[PDB]
Swiss-Prot record, chain A:
Sites annotated Increases basicity of active site His: D208
Catalyzed chemical reaction(s): (R)-mandelonitrile = benzaldehyde + hydrogen cyanide
Quaternary context: Homodimer.
Top EC class for this record: lyase
Protein family membership: Belongs to the AB hydrolase superfamily. Hydroxynitrile lyase family.
Naturally occurring in which organism (per UniProt): Arabidopsis thaliana (Mouse-ear cress)
A GO MF term: mandelonitrile lyase activity
Identification of the protein by name: Alpha-hydroxynitrile lyase
Record-annotated active site: S81, H236
Amino acid sequence: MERKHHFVLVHNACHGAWIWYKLKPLLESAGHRVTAVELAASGIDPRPIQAVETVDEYSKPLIETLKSLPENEEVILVGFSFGGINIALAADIFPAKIKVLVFLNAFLPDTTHVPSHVLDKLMEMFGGWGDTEFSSHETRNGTMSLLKMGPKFMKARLYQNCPIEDYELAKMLHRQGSLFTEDLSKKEKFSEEGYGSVQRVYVMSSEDKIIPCDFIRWMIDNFNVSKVYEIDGGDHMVMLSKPQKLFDSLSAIATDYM
Amino acid sequence: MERKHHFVLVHNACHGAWIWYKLKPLLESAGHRVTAVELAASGIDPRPIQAVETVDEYSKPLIETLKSLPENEEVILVGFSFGGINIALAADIFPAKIKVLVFLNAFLPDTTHVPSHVLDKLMEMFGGWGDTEFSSHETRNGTMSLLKMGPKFMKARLYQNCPIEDYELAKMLHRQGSLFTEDLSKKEKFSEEGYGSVQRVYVMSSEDKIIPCDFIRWMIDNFNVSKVYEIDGGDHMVMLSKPQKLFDSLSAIATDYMG
Ligand SMILES: *C1=[C][C]=[C][C]=[C@]1(*)[C@](*)(O(*)*)C(*)(*)#N
Ligand SMILES: *O(*)[C@@](*)([C@]1(*)=[C][C]=[C][C]=[C]1)C(*)(*)(*)(*)#N
Ligand SMILES: O=Cc1ccccc1
Ligand SMILES: O=Cc1ccccc1
């Protein structure tokens, strides 16, 4: 009996813990423990995104999850898409609780530029927003940029390799959210002693039509990882299009940090 | 090419439109149109159940769905569990917009007794609620009873024939809700001219551990339906445990109500 791990899963913006519904039982059937976090104003969280003005407030459920682990427990901390920013923020707080960070089709921030850097780059490059709806909301500390995916955009750019039932599920659960670009432009840089110090790996899907493979090299060039894993045939929503293969990669990761 | 229909699907308490994620594409593939209503304080609706103090506010998204339909359109209205109550309520308002009511694993109220009658009767005899959490919320109508399912109760009594992924989904998404039994016990009886006038059928799952098949016979004995369909092996959450069979029943229904 090889030693099992505690995986903490962190969803993407505009989604919630539900995205993990296929992966969670897989990992649990192998003996691992799983905590799928629901971030603020996400999923069935009762707050609107407008009430959650900062990335720290957005991430607080994940900080609380880690704070509540018993003394000396460490987890494998998986961040998906914007979830990469969330787990970098957590790692800067609780580095000794994290065995390894798994950046899954994720923004991988560095300790040199402002925290928004990798998001601002993608936003300059990306062309295919489609029917996504962009809006603002003024807060007492400045404009907060909001977004709500449109269904055609979802289909073409996030869910194109998923079963149709998954796409219908997503249409009934996705919500307006934010990438907190303003807030993250004003935040202190991520630290070397906290986030920098934690082991990290990247897991990319070969057919991610939102986080392209050149943009990943660019992020990794800019901030190195231990190892890159590739999921052959995954769309951006890889826990839905290729859950078994994702399990396989996570299981490999767990073996390299036994 | 036979004429296809517009199905309006209404979820159960403590759930949401998401429950229909498997059945929706089956119906759409077959050429039908599908609206899966998200009721108040349900699924991703932004209000807590404490803000939804009556069954009429609970049901308002469905009423609004029917109100918005173009002139002369009629729908196959499907109500699941507590969704039977909701579709009865809607048929008392827009009876001419409904081709047929489909009571799926559902409460089938009558026009003789108070609207809560059939729930009160199950509540009398109901098994064990397991790890379900009950709370009371005070309102300008008096006390509202709230319930939040427990995960053991879910697994045993609602989801026992569902794939484990679907029980995990539901753990991620279920919410505190209400059966509105106080509000329903005070409300005007459903009318014969409205609700009573609409065509109705029943579809039951043979392994429903919440709505047992004797109680269903009792409801149908007390308020007749045109046809009864059974889904062999379905648990309560039949749209997740046997979506294809459910689609087969709805398809048979639709064959009976093309004009
Ligand atoms: C409804 C009615 C009686 C017991 C349990 C429920 C539950 O909310 C469902 N479906
Ligand atoms: O909301 C999407 C997204 C798209 C572009 C950039 C960041 C996030 C996801 N996940
Ligand atoms: O805020 C509007 C916008 C539009 C296209 C790309 C990025 C932002
Ligand atoms: O509706 C409240 C209640 C409480 C205990 C048992 C059964 C029902």
